[PDB]
């Protein structure tokens, strides 16, 4: 049995040698003539309240106005970012939730939960009241993130070592991807909508292929857990946050590591990461009450957000690039601009 | 000004807020308690009468709701962060199986020193107390074999049973009192297998925890 491990170690050493040979010069040193952006000051343009619990997930949708937020209160609320008015307050069967998702068509909403069942609620209906449309079950593990491909497909990640691609009408698991030898805590869909990355608690980020059904590339680092991942607008890079203070930017065409962001006086952990429309802000939450903003091309922190009193669970940049929504473990949700 | 549709939308928003607040007002009557314990130690017998088992009971016009998590995986450092606002974490161990007992203390320590769940005071229980007396009276096995500190321990039914019970209790008490100070404490309560007064003890301990929280929060102490 030792020969198998020797062969695996030899292959790993060969891969490491190939990566080292392919490396020419780090991005952190070539971009030295680029003038850094000035101090970025953002005020709380709006505050949304009346939830009475801890916010866990939030999603914007294809439009820049509507916003879906979920919490442990047992109510999933749809807001309005221009007038701070509520549209729907959908109850939940199970009090414990961990994720929410807003469909690109603007007609369906997806929940999660500490249970194994992923619920899909309808919005546009003849009667005028939101009712549960589907309940996809049989996963054996708490869900972490739900994402919509279109109105007839959905991709989910759970606590066990699997990521599933379902089918709303049939209800069965169309495809399943196995790996990560541990928990899976993040998900994000590429703009091409053909590939998607997943981050695990094994300190591994993998690039799953939707069409085929097998992993293609894997990236390692962070020395610890991973609980936040996001893409780059180009589609050839992605950013990953970790349990320690570091946030890393990984290249997709070449399986390397480009830059790492961390300060010597930071001892907290990262909860959510999301880029900007132009891809030069890399907004990142933190375990402590603050939330920093990094210059993506040159690792010089620029500006800070005041933040809430408990923590920063989810942070989202709108598709138009003119708003940043931050949730928290206290009920208040803040829209900055 | 604002058009008619905007005013109607604002009125609907106000009605939604009123209904949501009125519905959430009933979330304070029920007190939520988590349950933790070992597989061999009784977990559904202390309180008479994937998944999440739930138990509801009523003591002196107070409603208690208890959650037991089962069907998940062994690694529990991620889904336990949700149980951050629970009133108490009932902990049930076994005091009649020495071999596994050393494991149980670890489950008490990691919970006590956790960065989250820090301000939640556990309510310890010691099941299978009747078997402890039978095992102590018999001389086939002695607790000194696994615990080398028992041979010199002195007392701070038969006296041997009392000494063994107090040693077992102090083993958890020391771990509880070493780390945390002024935020949470433990309660041994020395239960039995078929005792029918557990609900009263849980009610009294919850009252004490709530009173301590109010005193600390209002700044009186």
């Amino acid at each position: 049995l030792d020969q198998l491990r020797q062969e695996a170690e030899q292959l790993k050493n060969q891969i490491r040698d190939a990566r080292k040979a392919c490396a020419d010069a780090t991005l952190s040193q070539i971009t030295n003539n680029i003038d850094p952006v000035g101090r970025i000051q953002m005020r709380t343009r709006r505050t949304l309240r009346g939830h009475l619990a801890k916010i866990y997930a939030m999603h914007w949708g294809t439009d820049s106005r509507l916003l879906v937020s979920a919490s442990q209160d047992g109510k999933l609320i749809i807001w309005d970012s221009y007038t701070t008015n509520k549209v729907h307050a959908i109850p939940l069967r199970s009090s414990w939730v961990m994720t929410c998702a807003y469909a690109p068509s603007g007609n369906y909403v997806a929940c999660g939960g500490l249970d194994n069942i992923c619920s899909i609620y309808n919005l546009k209906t003849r009667e005028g009241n939101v009712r549960v449309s589907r309940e996809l079950a049989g996963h054996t593990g708490y869900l972490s993130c739900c994402r919509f491909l279109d109105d007839n497909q959905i991709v989910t990640s759970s606590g066990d070592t699997t990521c599933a691609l379902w089918d709303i009408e049939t209800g069965q698991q169309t495809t399943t991807f196995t790996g990560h030898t541990g928990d899976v805590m993040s998900l994000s869909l590429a703009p091409d909508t053909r590939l998607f990355v997943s981050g695990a608690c094994d300190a591994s980020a993998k690039l799953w292929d939707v069409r085929e059904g097998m992993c293609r590339q894997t990236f390692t680092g962070h020395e610890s857990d991973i609980n936040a991942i996001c893409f780059f607008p180009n589609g050839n890079a992605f950013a990953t946050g970790s349990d320690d203070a570091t946030c890393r930017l990984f290249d997709l065409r070449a399986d390397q590591e480009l830059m790492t962001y961390s300060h010597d006086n930071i001892i907290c952990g990262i909860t959510s990461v999301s880029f900007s429309k132009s891809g030069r802000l890399l907004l990142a939450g933190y375990d402590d009450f603050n939330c920093n903003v990094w210059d993506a091309l040159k690792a010089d922190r620029a500006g800070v957000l005041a933040g809430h009193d408990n923590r920063v669970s989810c942070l989202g940049v709108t598709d138009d690039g003119m708003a940043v929504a931050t949730g928290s473990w206290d009920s208040f949700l803040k829209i900055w601009n | 000004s604002v058009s008619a549709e905007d005013k109607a939308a604002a009125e609907r928003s106000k009605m939604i807020d009123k209904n949501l607040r009125e519905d959430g007002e009933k979330a304070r009557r029920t007190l939520r308690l988590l349950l933790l314990g070992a597989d061999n130690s009784g977990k559904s017998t202390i309180v008479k009468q994937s998944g999440i088992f739930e138990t509801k009971f009523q003591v002196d016009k107070v409603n208690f709701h208890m959650f037991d998590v089962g069907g998940q995986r062994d690694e529990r450092r991620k889904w336990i962060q949700c149980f951050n606002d629970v009133t108490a974490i009932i902990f049930v161990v076994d005091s009649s199986d020495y071999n596994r007992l050393q494991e149980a203390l670890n489950d008490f320590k990691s919970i006590w020193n956790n960065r989250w769940l820090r301000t939640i005071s556990v309510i310890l229980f010691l099941n299978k107390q009747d078997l402890l007396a039978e095992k102590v009276l018999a001389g086939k096995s002695k607790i000194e074999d696994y615990f080398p500190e028992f041979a010199r321990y002195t007392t701070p039914e038969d006296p041997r049973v009392t000494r063994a019970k107090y040693f077992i209790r102090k083993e958890f008490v020391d771990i509880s009192t070493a780390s945390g100070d002024g935020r949470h404490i433990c309660y041994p309560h020395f239960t039995c297998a078929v005792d029918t007064e557990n609900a009263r003890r849980i009610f009294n301990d919850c009252k004490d925890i709530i009173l301590q929280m109010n005193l600390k929060e209002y700044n009186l102490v």
Epitope: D225, I267 | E75, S110
Partner: nanobody
Framework: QVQLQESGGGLVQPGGSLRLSCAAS????????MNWVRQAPGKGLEWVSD????????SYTGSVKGRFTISRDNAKNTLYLQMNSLKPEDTAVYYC?????????????????????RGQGTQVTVSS
């Protein structure tokens, strides 16, 4: 790249001292607690040692207290465990484990059926 290796095992007569060394790589060794755990044949994982970051606050389990010495060296990242006297019941595989998160004293999932940061392990045999 969080691989952990172990060395120093083998077979030894009952009553002889033996040393085990755990080597770590890929992370700053001076930020995480460390533990030694064991698995006997037909038994579950049992936590058997502990060591904090700086070197103080050394804990132990009752069954091996006063006969095992655990030390940590940071210059060359190494974890040493030395056993003075041995009994026939101490025939088990030993695993070197690290706490999940840095700058904490939790060690919440040191022992588990499957784990990410834990070495392959070496086996020690006494009296066959």
């Amino acid at each position: 790249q969080v691989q952990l290796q172990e060395s120093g095992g083998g077979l030894v007569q009952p009553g002889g001292s033996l040393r085990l060394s755990c080597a770590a790589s890929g992370f700053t060794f001076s930020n995480y607690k460390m533990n030694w755990v064991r698995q006997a044949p037909g038994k579950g994982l049992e936590w058997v040692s502990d060591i904090s970051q700086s070197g103080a606050s050394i804990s132990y389990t009752g069954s091996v207290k006063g006969r095992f010495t655990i030390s940590r060296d940071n210059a060359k990242n190494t974890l040493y465990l030395q056993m003075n006297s041995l009994k026939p019941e101490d025939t088990a595989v030993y695993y070197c484990a690290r706490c999940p998160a840095p700058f904490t004293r939790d060690c919440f999932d040191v022992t588990s059926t499957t784990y990410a940061y834990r070495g392959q392990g070496t086996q020690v045999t006494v009296s066959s």
